[PDB]
């Protein structure tokens, strides 16, 4: 059900969709979407799990 309710089924549109979910619009063409998605959780600068 979680997959069937997902309107996007590829990796590219998923990135821009999650960026639009995070940032107030301003969708990037594989430039800021992937970078922000990797910086918000997978970056040691803005993520400091002790």
């Amino acid at each position: 059900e979680t997959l069937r309710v997902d309107p996007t089924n590829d990796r590219l549109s998923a990135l821009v969709e999650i960026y639009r979910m995070m940032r107030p619009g301003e969708p990037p063409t594989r430039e800021a979407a992937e970078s922000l998605f990797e910086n918000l959780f997978f970056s040691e600068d803005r993520y400091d799990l002790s």
């Binding site: 619009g25 301003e26 969708p27 990037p28 063409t29 430039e31 800021a32």
Partner: protein, 112 residues
């Protein structure tokens, strides 16, 4: 075309915005994509006191704007720098520049 796109930054620090943007463009050696940051915003008018002629020569509504060609990556570069309070222009995130009449008008203003 090397369009004259308009943007508004943090007021008061607008000279600091100009130099920060200039240094950022000069670091990424992207001179073939971007231009100036409206250095002509220096109206030499002043309050000329007696025996002390210290003149800052700064009088303009601000609005540091950069001559640039519209690109998504370039937009992300110019927003990654600080002082991006408002990227004005009627749009979602991709605006349009202003015609050459206002360019001639601001050139006249610089001439004065």
């Amino acid at each position: 075309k090397k369009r004259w796109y308009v943007v508004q930054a943090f007021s008061g620090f607008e000279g600091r915005v100009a130099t920060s943007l200039r240094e950022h463009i000069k670091l990424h050696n992207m001179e073939d994509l971007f231009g100036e940051v409206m250095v002509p915003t220096e109206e030499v008018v002043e309050i000329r006191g007696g025996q002390r002629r210290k003149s800052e020569r700064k009088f303009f509504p601000g609005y540091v704007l950069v001559q640039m060609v519209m690109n998504d990556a370039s937009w992300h570069l110019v927003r990654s720098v600080p002082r991006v309070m408002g990227f004005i222009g009627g749009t979602s995130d991709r605006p349009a520049p202003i015609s050459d009449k206002e360019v001639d008008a601001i050139m006249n203003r610089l001439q004065q």
